[PDB]
Short mmCIF file of all heavy atoms in Angstrom, two decimals:
data_model
loop_
_atom_site.label_atom_id
_atom_site.label_comp_id
_atom_site.label_asym_id
_atom_site.label_seq_id
_atom_site.Cartn_x
_atom_site.Cartn_y
_atom_site.Cartn_z
N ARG C 1 41.53 -49.01 128.02
CA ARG C 1 42.39 -48.50 129.09
C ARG C 1 41.54 -48.49 130.35
O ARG C 1 40.74 -47.58 130.58
CB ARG C 1 42.95 -47.13 128.74
CG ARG C 1 43.92 -47.18 127.58
CD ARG C 1 44.67 -45.89 127.42
NE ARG C 1 45.71 -45.99 126.40
CZ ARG C 1 45.61 -45.51 125.16
NH1 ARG C 1 44.54 -44.85 124.78
NH2 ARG C 1 46.62 -45.66 124.31
N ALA C 2 41.69 -49.53 131.16
CA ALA C 2 40.93 -49.68 132.39
C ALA C 2 41.86 -49.75 133.59
O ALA C 2 42.99 -50.24 133.50
CB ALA C 2 40.06 -50.93 132.34
N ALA C 3 41.37 -49.25 134.72
CA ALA C 3 42.02 -49.45 136.01
C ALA C 3 41.49 -50.73 136.64
O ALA C 3 40.81 -51.53 136.01
CB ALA C 3 41.78 -48.24 136.92
N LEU C 4 41.82 -50.94 137.90
CA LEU C 4 41.35 -52.13 138.58
C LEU C 4 40.22 -51.76 139.53
O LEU C 4 39.73 -50.63 139.56
CB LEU C 4 42.50 -52.80 139.31
CG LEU C 4 43.64 -53.20 138.40
CD1 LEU C 4 44.78 -53.68 139.25
CD2 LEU C 4 43.20 -54.26 137.43
N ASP C 5 39.80 -52.73 140.31
CA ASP C 5 38.91 -52.52 141.44
C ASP C 5 39.65 -51.79 142.56
O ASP C 5 40.84 -52.02 142.78
CB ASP C 5 38.41 -53.87 141.93
CG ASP C 5 39.51 -54.88 142.04
OD1 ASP C 5 40.64 -54.58 141.58
OD2 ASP C 5 39.25 -55.98 142.55
N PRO C 6 38.95 -50.92 143.30
CA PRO C 6 39.64 -50.09 144.30
C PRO C 6 40.17 -50.84 145.50
O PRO C 6 40.83 -50.20 146.34
CB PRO C 6 38.55 -49.10 144.73
CG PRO C 6 37.31 -49.80 144.46
CD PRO C 6 37.52 -50.60 143.23
N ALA C 7 39.90 -52.14 145.63
CA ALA C 7 40.55 -52.93 146.67
C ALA C 7 41.91 -53.45 146.23
O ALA C 7 42.76 -53.73 147.08
CB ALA C 7 39.66 -54.11 147.05
N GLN C 8 42.14 -53.59 144.93
CA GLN C 8 43.51 -53.80 144.47
C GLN C 8 44.27 -52.50 144.31
O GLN C 8 45.50 -52.51 144.34
CB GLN C 8 43.52 -54.57 143.16
CG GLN C 8 43.33 -56.05 143.32
CD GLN C 8 43.30 -56.75 141.99
OE1 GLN C 8 43.13 -56.10 140.96
NE2 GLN C 8 43.53 -58.05 141.99
N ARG C 9 43.57 -51.38 144.16
CA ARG C 9 44.21 -50.10 143.93
C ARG C 9 44.78 -49.57 145.25
O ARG C 9 44.15 -48.80 145.97
CB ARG C 9 43.22 -49.12 143.30
CG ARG C 9 42.79 -49.54 141.91
CD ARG C 9 41.68 -48.68 141.33
NE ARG C 9 42.10 -47.31 141.10
CZ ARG C 9 41.60 -46.26 141.75
NH1 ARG C 9 40.64 -46.42 142.64
NH2 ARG C 9 42.05 -45.04 141.47
N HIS C 10 46.00 -50.02 145.56
CA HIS C 10 46.81 -49.42 146.62
C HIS C 10 48.28 -49.73 146.38
O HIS C 10 48.68 -50.89 146.45
CB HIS C 10 46.42 -49.91 148.01
CG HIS C 10 47.29 -49.35 149.09
ND1 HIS C 10 48.41 -50.00 149.56
CD2 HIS C 10 47.25 -48.16 149.74
CE1 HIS C 10 49.00 -49.26 150.48
NE2 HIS C 10 48.32 -48.14 150.61
N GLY C 11 49.08 -48.69 146.18
CA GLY C 11 50.50 -48.85 145.96
C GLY C 11 50.94 -48.18 144.68
O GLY C 11 50.17 -48.13 143.72
N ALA C 12 52.18 -47.68 144.65
CA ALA C 12 52.68 -47.02 143.45
C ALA C 12 52.75 -47.90 142.20
O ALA C 12 52.57 -47.35 141.10
CB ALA C 12 54.06 -46.40 143.73
N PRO C 13 52.99 -49.22 142.26
CA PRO C 13 52.63 -50.03 141.09
C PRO C 13 51.14 -50.15 140.91
O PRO C 13 50.65 -50.05 139.78
CB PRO C 13 53.27 -51.39 141.39
CG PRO C 13 54.34 -51.11 142.30
CD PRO C 13 53.87 -49.98 143.16
N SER C 14 50.41 -50.36 142.00
CA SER C 14 49.00 -50.72 141.92
C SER C 14 48.15 -49.52 141.54
O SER C 14 47.45 -49.54 140.52
CB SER C 14 48.53 -51.29 143.25
OG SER C 14 47.14 -51.48 143.23
N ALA C 15 48.17 -48.47 142.35
CA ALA C 15 47.59 -47.22 141.90
C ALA C 15 48.53 -46.61 140.87
O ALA C 15 49.75 -46.77 140.94
CB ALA C 15 47.38 -46.26 143.07
N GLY C 16 47.95 -45.93 139.90
CA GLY C 16 48.74 -45.49 138.77
C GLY C 16 49.04 -46.64 137.85
O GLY C 16 50.20 -46.89 137.49
N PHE C 17 48.00 -47.38 137.47
CA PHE C 17 48.16 -48.52 136.58
C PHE C 17 46.91 -48.69 135.74
O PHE C 17 45.82 -48.88 136.28
CB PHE C 17 48.45 -49.78 137.36
CG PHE C 17 48.36 -51.01 136.54
CD1 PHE C 17 49.20 -51.20 135.46
CD2 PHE C 17 47.46 -52.00 136.86
CE1 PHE C 17 49.11 -52.32 134.69
CE2 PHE C 17 47.38 -53.15 136.11
CZ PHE C 17 48.20 -53.31 135.02
N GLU C 18 47.09 -48.65 134.42
CA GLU C 18 46.01 -48.87 133.46
C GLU C 18 46.20 -50.23 132.82
O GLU C 18 47.14 -50.42 132.04
CB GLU C 18 45.97 -47.78 132.39
CG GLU C 18 45.44 -46.44 132.84
CD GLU C 18 45.35 -45.47 131.69
OE1 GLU C 18 45.83 -45.81 130.59
OE2 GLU C 18 44.79 -44.37 131.88
N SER C 19 45.30 -51.15 133.13
CA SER C 19 45.28 -52.44 132.46
C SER C 19 44.86 -52.24 131.01
O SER C 19 44.15 -51.29 130.67
CB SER C 19 44.31 -53.38 133.15
OG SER C 19 44.69 -53.61 134.49
N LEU C 20 45.31 -53.14 130.14
CA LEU C 20 45.11 -52.98 128.70
C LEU C 20 44.49 -54.22 128.09
O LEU C 20 45.21 -55.12 127.64
CB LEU C 20 46.41 -52.62 128.00
CG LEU C 20 46.93 -51.23 128.34
CD1 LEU C 20 48.27 -50.96 127.67
CD2 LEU C 20 45.90 -50.23 127.90
N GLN C 21 43.17 -54.27 128.03
CA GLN C 21 42.52 -55.17 127.09
C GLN C 21 42.73 -54.66 125.67
O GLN C 21 42.95 -53.47 125.44
CB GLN C 21 41.02 -55.26 127.36
CG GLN C 21 40.56 -55.99 128.57
CD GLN C 21 40.55 -57.48 128.37
OE1 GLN C 21 40.21 -57.97 127.29
NE2 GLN C 21 40.90 -58.22 129.40
N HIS C 22 42.63 -55.57 124.72
CA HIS C 22 42.70 -55.21 123.30
C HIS C 22 41.68 -56.12 122.62
O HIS C 22 42.00 -57.24 122.25
CB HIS C 22 44.09 -55.40 122.72
CG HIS C 22 45.13 -54.50 123.31
ND1 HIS C 22 45.27 -53.18 122.94
CD2 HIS C 22 46.09 -54.73 124.23
CE1 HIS C 22 46.27 -52.64 123.60
NE2 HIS C 22 46.78 -53.56 124.40
N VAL C 23 40.46 -55.62 122.46
CA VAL C 23 39.39 -56.44 121.95
C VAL C 23 39.23 -56.16 120.47
O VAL C 23 39.77 -55.20 119.92
CB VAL C 23 38.06 -56.19 122.71
CG1 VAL C 23 38.32 -56.22 124.19
CG2 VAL C 23 37.44 -54.90 122.30
N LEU C 24 38.47 -57.02 119.80
CA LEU C 24 38.20 -56.88 118.38
C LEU C 24 36.71 -56.59 118.19
O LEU C 24 35.87 -57.46 118.39
CB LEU C 24 38.61 -58.13 117.63
CG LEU C 24 38.29 -58.00 116.15
CD1 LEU C 24 39.03 -56.82 115.55
CD2 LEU C 24 38.67 -59.28 115.45
N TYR C 25 36.40 -55.36 117.80
CA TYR C 25 35.03 -54.96 117.54
C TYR C 25 34.69 -55.18 116.07
O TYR C 25 35.54 -55.01 115.19
CB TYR C 25 34.81 -53.50 117.94
CG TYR C 25 33.40 -53.06 117.72
CD1 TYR C 25 32.37 -53.57 118.49
CD2 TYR C 25 33.08 -52.14 116.73
CE1 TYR C 25 31.07 -53.18 118.29
CE2 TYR C 25 31.78 -51.75 116.53
CZ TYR C 25 30.79 -52.27 117.31
OH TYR C 25 29.50 -51.89 117.10
N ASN C 26 33.43 -55.57 115.82
CA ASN C 26 32.92 -56.06 114.53
C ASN C 26 33.73 -57.25 114.02
O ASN C 26 33.90 -57.42 112.82
CB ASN C 26 32.87 -54.97 113.47
CG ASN C 26 31.80 -53.95 113.73
OD1 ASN C 26 30.69 -54.29 114.15
ND2 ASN C 26 32.11 -52.70 113.46
N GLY C 27 34.20 -58.08 114.94
CA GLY C 27 35.09 -59.15 114.58
C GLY C 27 34.50 -60.53 114.76
O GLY C 27 33.52 -60.71 115.49
N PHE C 28 35.10 -61.50 114.12
CA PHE C 28 34.56 -62.84 114.08
C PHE C 28 35.71 -63.82 114.23
O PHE C 28 36.80 -63.60 113.69
CB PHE C 28 33.76 -63.07 112.78
CG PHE C 28 34.60 -63.02 111.53
CD1 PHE C 28 34.94 -64.18 110.88
CD2 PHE C 28 34.99 -61.81 110.98
CE1 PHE C 28 35.69 -64.15 109.73
CE2 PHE C 28 35.75 -61.78 109.83
CZ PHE C 28 36.10 -62.95 109.21
N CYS C 29 35.46 -64.89 114.97
CA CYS C 29 36.47 -65.91 115.19
C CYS C 29 36.75 -66.69 113.92
O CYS C 29 35.99 -66.63 112.95
CB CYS C 29 36.04 -66.88 116.28
SG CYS C 29 37.23 -68.21 116.50
N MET C 30 37.85 -67.43 113.92
CA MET C 30 38.20 -68.22 112.76
C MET C 30 38.45 -69.67 113.15
O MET C 30 39.38 -69.97 113.91
CB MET C 30 39.42 -67.64 112.05
CG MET C 30 39.83 -68.49 110.87
SD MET C 30 41.10 -67.72 109.89
CE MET C 30 40.11 -66.48 109.09
N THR C 31 37.62 -70.56 112.62
CA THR C 31 37.96 -71.98 112.59
C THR C 31 39.13 -72.22 111.65
O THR C 31 40.21 -72.64 112.08
CB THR C 31 36.73 -72.78 112.14
OG1 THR C 31 35.73 -72.70 113.15
CG2 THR C 31 37.07 -74.23 111.80
N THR C 32 38.95 -71.93 110.37
CA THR C 32 39.94 -72.16 109.34
C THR C 32 39.89 -71.00 108.36
O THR C 32 38.91 -70.25 108.31
CB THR C 32 39.71 -73.49 108.60
OG1 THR C 32 38.34 -73.59 108.22
CG2 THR C 32 40.13 -74.69 109.43
N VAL C 33 40.94 -70.88 107.56
CA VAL C 33 41.01 -69.79 106.58
C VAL C 33 40.03 -70.08 105.45
O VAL C 33 40.06 -71.18 104.87
CB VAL C 33 42.43 -69.66 106.04
CG1 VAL C 33 42.49 -68.58 104.97
CG2 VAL C 33 43.39 -69.36 107.17
N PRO C 34 39.13 -69.15 105.13
CA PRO C 34 38.37 -69.25 103.88
C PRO C 34 39.31 -69.15 102.70
O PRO C 34 40.09 -68.21 102.59
CB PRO C 34 37.43 -68.05 103.95
CG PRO C 34 37.32 -67.75 105.35
CD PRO C 34 38.64 -68.04 105.96
N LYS C 35 39.24 -70.14 101.82
CA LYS C 35 40.16 -70.15 100.68
C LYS C 35 39.77 -69.13 99.62
O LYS C 35 40.65 -68.57 98.96
CB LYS C 35 40.22 -71.54 100.05
CG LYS C 35 41.16 -72.55 100.70
CD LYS C 35 40.54 -73.25 101.90
CE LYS C 35 41.42 -74.42 102.36
NZ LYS C 35 40.87 -75.15 103.54
N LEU C 36 38.48 -68.87 99.45
CA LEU C 36 38.05 -68.01 98.35
C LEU C 36 38.07 -66.54 98.73
O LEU C 36 38.50 -65.70 97.94
CB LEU C 36 36.65 -68.39 97.88
CG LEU C 36 36.38 -69.65 97.05
CD1 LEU C 36 36.47 -70.93 97.87
CD2 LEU C 36 35.00 -69.55 96.42
#
């Protein structure tokens, strides 16, 4: 739950807005599904 930089933060949409990353911690990318 992050806000923006204070130069974008102006306006009732702009201020009062929490951007939402959704990251994967302890996670690993997938080339292909491991079958086993």
Side-chain angles (χ1 to χ4, degrees):
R1 293 192 174 102
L4 301 173
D5 46 352
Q8 280 177 344
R9 295 173 65 245
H10 177 267
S14 173
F17 169 62
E18 286 184 352
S19 299
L20 291 177
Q21 288 279 322
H22 295 282
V23 312
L24 178 60
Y25 181 69
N26 289 320
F28 65 104
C29 177
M30 178 172 286
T31 292
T32 48
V33 177
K35 277 83 170 179
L36 285 74

